Design a protein around this ligand. Structure first.
Ligand SMILES: Nc1ncnc2c1ncn2[C@@H]1O[C@H](COP(=O)(O)OP(=O)(O)OP(=O)(O)O)[C@@H](O)[C@H]1O
Lengths: 835, 430, 158, 143
């Protein structure tokens, strides 16, 4: 039963019983210490990294040994713990030990009453101390005076030392023996604190232990890190090599053999001092409480509130679980517990300061933004790792712009361009591992409570590194110059708008001239700006004026042109998504919504990246204004994570790869008004580009969104819709009834998909006139698809007569695209027809 | 709610009520200081990357703790702020702290009139002072002299040193304990200033805090760039490695593990010295008033004109918006808010001086608005103008001067596509 | 009293026998802090000298350090330490690139020589250069405020 | 002790349990053999004795502290997981070689994220990608 009170100071000095994390080792060491005496140098080493609690451990060992020392068969007196870092820089350790030993002895003489025995054993003690003072210069001398030879040849004493000469260890050995007689103890414990704070001063501890602490009446307990003593020992065996030899034999053959010798003298210097059978490894908090399935060797509980009852105290893994899950907006499972495990493997001081800072402000805040509490808690603890890894550190500049830059500068060092945006604690280095949980808190804090910041992190944050894992990585110091150019061109960290990112993102996927020269790309299709001959069928140069209402608005938000030797023109889904990320940010006023469609269309000049060789429109605004009304009351309960945004991009990116190549072929002569799956056109590619985003959001919303604990897709193969709709239709059908079963609505369980499926900007792209897979029986799926969508959003996207025109083989369309199918894709050969 | 009158002699010291922005944070820190001594190293860090008025906040804490001692359950006597960069190059911080502790204690002794504990405690006070003088050589000695060993065994001390030897941290903690009784207080406050000018002298501050200021009757408030302490601590851990090992094991695998080891010693040095739960961040004006997207955590009002009343006041977001929109000839909207947000991220003392230099001068003209904002910025923002290489000579202003600066701005901004918008989307604060 | 505290300026090490001198509190001093602060004793000298000389301020005048710019560091350190009095006006000439050359050289001396030798990777070397450059401006802008600097005009400007 | 059979000048016997006598002691080669074939989950053969001969070449201080650690934790634990006991015994003795080789040394990393990465660093230094992953004691360096 171990309970840690977070509102207590929780310091190594101010830690009483009943909260010792190391209670199994404290008892195990003490009995093993007593066993050694009850049965030669006797040194116990308590291993452990920095912040493990080594000072707190020995502090408990002395407390558990000084109690009932005379009430047990083997009496062991303990000196106060010696801290090698806090001692005077030049004070010998033997001086410190003797000074602390003299105080213990003198205090015992003042407890005696028989003056005959008091005076008999005080003359001996003063004689031994005076003899130690006489020979103390042997340590603090830079030369050997010839007149000291008389001291070695003096025998004017009754000691009758075994070996001749003024051996200081011999003088100290009987000094300890005299002290044991006075204190009436069978041994004396010399506890040495760790040297981790300043480890160059721990050499005197090592040399003193092996020289003067060899007696059977001395028990030495020294803690620290063997990884740190090894560097101290190795650097001192190198000082035994003459400087001239090192300078004259700098070549590898003899240099390597010397290094083999030093590591082979270091190895046995540790084995001589701290024997393996006596070392004790301090267990980190993960090894105590254990995992969910593995039995917890101990039971650690945390008092997360002031005045909390002992029964009320909650388990530490649950306490970390609450902070990690709510702080990162993350749901119970492998991903949430992967962060919790990493926080447990942290040094105890670092972990106990994350919890202390998080739960102190959490309680104080109520007297909420839990992700903000964890962001500040992790910022302070992982600050040394943030500085090392080069992440943003100023707190007045925290925001979306200063976060997407951090995600790019993190995966660049992590080298995980495929899954780095997940921000999982997987990096081998501890600095990048520490930043991963801090960055995850940053993403779960900024994007929380707003849909606009979710899409900016999706495109600018997660996307920018994927648009680097391809289309920029083939060009690769040159790599650091490529990074410098790429982030300056795309202006990540200072983006003007999400749409502005998409237009630059259009060029990089365009300034990489793909094979077959077809102007069909990942999530973007090129369209001709000029008219020529040789165009069969109804294919024609794209004209924006053909579309009406939302149809004109939807393309205007999607069209993006880049200035080059010739003005390329593109229709991307990133521009469509970036437009949504811009409308959501602004207010519900009509004036601001109008500018969103008109931020890029006719006032931007997207020069190619340097790494290249060369009214009814008011009705459209009304629908967007109505949708923005929904966003401002639904997005307040959104809980996006760094995992969800990373996952949603991953599926959305994978689909855009499938639809890119699976439609690079089906661009045949009769593809206009495509009705079979073997014919595709600009209305087909863009329909599944948009439907890819609506699916990636849909499938991994229920999978990973923290608002709904349960899973509503159920168990099955989560195939994604490419050139088809049944894959999307299968999942959207089966989700609907489960919420009715659980008495939950579509908006309070999948707020992200509900908002994006009800966005009028992408509504014309869901059912383009050109893009409809009205097969003999697949049209029933789309008929169900339209019915499901019309019920999710609450409004009929297309009227009964409007739907019949798309399926059955004039009409004006104010809600669906019209001229996209007739558009001519650059680099497409319109000579081969569908067979 | 804070309401600032912009027509005043502009005294940072006379500001005591209704004019100090950081009162909300100061009260929380002071209450935290008092609560940390009820139950032990209490070290508080007032963090900030640049500016923000560091020295005035810690001084404001000293005033808040030196006064109102009768009402509070626990009273704290505060040493005068110690500037580590304005001290003799070899004087230890322990000497500086004790000397200012002696000055406070001795001045209190002259306040005594009951001449029974006046000389009883003074005699005891000088006993601790002389004993600290006796053991002061341990911080300045370049070698150990065997004659010191006799001193370490002197067990005639009347104050009962529990651990033997001459431990200055043990002598100093009893010296503080006696000082607390004399001053009739508890938990003496030690405040340190920034080490920005010469951060080589901040290592003695860190080593003194962890060694000598570990007492439960000692609370420390440190200030400065915590990114600069990291470079100070990290560079000192390399000093532990022997010069022979460093110049012999020069392989990449050996150099990486040496850096990684120091990455962990430095990491735990900051956590031990400045605990995360005790670090204090100076809130900027934007955080205090909110982003206007929703209600902020604090409401601050400004008296633009002389004679305005409590209700006759406007929010700083509006007062800044009034200056930006009129000064920059900008319309109300999103692009006008890009400048008010940046103006709200500035240090408060800098920000309200721009407001004072603009609004008050706008009165005297009434008895061109854009030049009033230009003059107001030039007076207080001149440091960045010089740093970036722009035009500072006021007589030379013009399109020939202006167009040269704008091309100079976009040259440093590395963005020629949208650089001429002059939107504060840059990276450098200047 | 100033002569008593002058050893602090010129001492290769701290001598413990001066600790009893730092505790020699006096009544005529009326010093805010009694830790033998040279910047406080000198402020009384200037305040007393103004009373004797019947002047509202004292102009301390420094020439330039072009011939030997090592000697300019003691000028900068003295100005920011002892010449902070309200009754003191300091006018200093010299190339500001030379004075910035001093501080940048001294700001690097704060870094431990072992840190500079061991951490020579471009990711950390460039981060130090960002910080030392940031330190020299704050040192320059605090010693010589920009609103008080005066630039001598060449012939073209004249 | 020599190779298998007598094959050696001195007949060194070792005691692996407290209260044991001088008559029921085990051969030092066999005591290393039992701790190796049980610890490494190997059978008797050339491969097991290849580790035994490598362990026998080790310094007596290093060799005894492997035997002392293995047979003092084994007796206490059982008054099982034999590979765990050998892992802890070899962790302390070979610790200086583990540090030099760059192998993971944190005792809370002892899964396979460390292990699957550990043998890649080991094989990389061994300069033998063909037979390195057998983890044979066939290297030319003591580390
Ligand atoms: N038994 C414990 N109970 C509560 N908190 C503990 C315990 N052990 C460690 N801690 C926490 O971990 C921190 C580290 O303690 P400790 O000072 O012993 O670690 P160390 O870094 O190994 O030692 P040192 O201070 O000597 O460098 C403590 O300050 C405390 O916050």
């Amino acid at each position: 039963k171990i309970i840690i009170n977070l509102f207590a100071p929780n310091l190594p000095g101010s830690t009483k019983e009943d909260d010792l994390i190391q209670k199994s080792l404290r008892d195990q060491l003490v009995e093993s210490i007593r066993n050694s005496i009850a049965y030669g140098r006797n040194v116990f080493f308590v291993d452990g990294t920095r912040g493990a609690g080594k000072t707190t451990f020995i502090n408990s060992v002395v407390k558990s040994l000084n109690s009932d020392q005379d009430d047990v068969k083997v009496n062991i007196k303990c000196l106060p713990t010696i801290d090698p870092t806090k001692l005077p820089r030049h004070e010998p350790i033997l001086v410190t030990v003797t000074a602390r030993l003299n105080k213990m002895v003198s205090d015992k003489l003042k407890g005696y009453w028989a003056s005959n025995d008091y005076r008999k054993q005080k003359e001996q003690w003063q004689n031994h101390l005076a003899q130690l003072q006489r020979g103390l210069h042997l340590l603090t001398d830079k030369e050997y005076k010839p007149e000291y030879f008389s001291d070695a040849l003096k025998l004017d004493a009754q000691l009758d030392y075994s070996i001749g000469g003024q051996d200081l260890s011999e003088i100290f050995e009987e000094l300890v023996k005299r002290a044991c007689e006075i204190l009436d103890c069978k041994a004396i414990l010399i506890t040495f604190d760790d040297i981790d704070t300043q480890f160059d001063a721990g050499w005197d501890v090592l040399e003193s232990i092996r020289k003067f602490f060899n007696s059977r009446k001395l028990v030495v307990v020294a803690t620290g890190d063997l990884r740190l003593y090894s560097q101290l020992i190795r650097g001192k065996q190198y000082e035994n090599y003459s400087k001239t030899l090192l300078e004259q034999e700098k070549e590898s053959v003899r240099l390597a053999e010397r290094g083999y010798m030093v590591e082979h003298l270091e190895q046995q210097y540790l084995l001589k001092l701290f024997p393996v059978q006596k070392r004790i490894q301090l267990k980190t908090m993960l090894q105590l409480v254990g995992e969910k399935g593995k039995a917890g060797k101990e039971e650690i509980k945390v008092k997360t509130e002031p005045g909390m009852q002992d029964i009320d105290a909650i388990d530490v893994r649950q306490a970390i679980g609450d902070a990690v899950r709510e702080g990162l907006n993350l749901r119970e499972g492998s991903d949430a517990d992967m962060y919790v495990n990493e926080l447990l493997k942290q040094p105890v001081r670092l972990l106990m300061q994350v919890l202390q800072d998080f739960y102190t402000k959490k309680y104080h805040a109520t007297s909420l933004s839990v992700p903000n509490l964890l962001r500040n808690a992790l910022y302070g603890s992982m600050l040394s790792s943030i500085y090392r890894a080069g992440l943003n550190y100023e707190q007045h500049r925290f925001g979306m712009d200063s976060l997407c830059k951090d995600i790019f500068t993190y995966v660049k060092q992590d080298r995980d361009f495929n899954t780095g945006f997940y921000l999982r604690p997987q990096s081998e280095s501890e600095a990048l591992r520490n930043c991963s949980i801090y960055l995850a808190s940053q993403v779960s804090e900024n994007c929380q409570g707003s849909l606009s910041k979710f899409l900016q992190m999706l495109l600018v944050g997660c996307g920018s590194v994927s648009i680097f894992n391809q289309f920029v990585t083939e060009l690769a110091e040159k790599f650091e110059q490529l990074i410098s150019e790429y982030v300056a061109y795309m202006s990540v960290g200072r983006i003007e708008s999400a749409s502005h990112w998409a237009n630059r993102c259009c060029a990089v996927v365009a300034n990489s001239p793909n094979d077959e020269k077809i102007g069909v790309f990942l999530g973007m299709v090129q369209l001709n700006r000029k008219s020529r001959q040789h165009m069969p069928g109804g294919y024609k140069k794209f004209n924006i004026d053909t579309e009406n209402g939302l149809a004109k608005a939807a393309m205007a938000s999607s069209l993006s042109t880049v200035a080059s030797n010739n003005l390329m023109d593109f229709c991307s889904v990133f521009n469509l998504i970036g437009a949504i990320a811009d409308i959501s940010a602004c207010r519900c006023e009509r004036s601001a919504i109008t500018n969103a469609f008109n931020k890029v269309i006719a006032q931007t000049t997207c020069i190619v990246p340097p790494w290249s060789e060369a009214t009814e429109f008011s009705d459209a605004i009304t629908k967007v204004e109505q949708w923005l009304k929904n966003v401002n009351e639904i997005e307040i309960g959104i809980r996006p994570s760094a995992l969800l945004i990373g996952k949603v991009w991953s599926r959305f990116y994978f689909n855009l790869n499938n639809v890119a190549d699976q439609h690079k072929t089906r661009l045949y002569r009769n593809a206009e008004h495509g009705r079979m799956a073997s014919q595709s056109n600009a209305a087909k590619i863009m329909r599944f580009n948009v439907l890819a985003f609506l699916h990636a959001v849909l499938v991994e919303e229920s999978l990973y969104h923290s608002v709904s604990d349960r899973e509503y897709i159920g168990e099955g193969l989560r195939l994604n819709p490419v050139t088809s709709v049944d894959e999307f239709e299968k999942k959207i059908k089966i989700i609907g009834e489960k919420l009715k079963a659980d008495n939950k609505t579509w908006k309070n369980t999948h707020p992200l998909f509900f908002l994006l499926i009800s966005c009028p900007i992408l509504h014309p792209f869901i059912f383009p006139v050109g893009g409809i897979n009205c097969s003999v029986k697949a049209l029933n799926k789309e008929t169900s698809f339209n019915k499901l969508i019309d019920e999710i959003v609450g409004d009929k996207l297309l009227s009964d007569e409007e739907w019949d025109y798309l399926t059955k083989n004039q009409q004006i369309f104010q809600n669906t695209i019209t001229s996209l199918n007739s558009s001519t894709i650059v680099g497409a050969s319109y000579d081969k027809d569908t067979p």
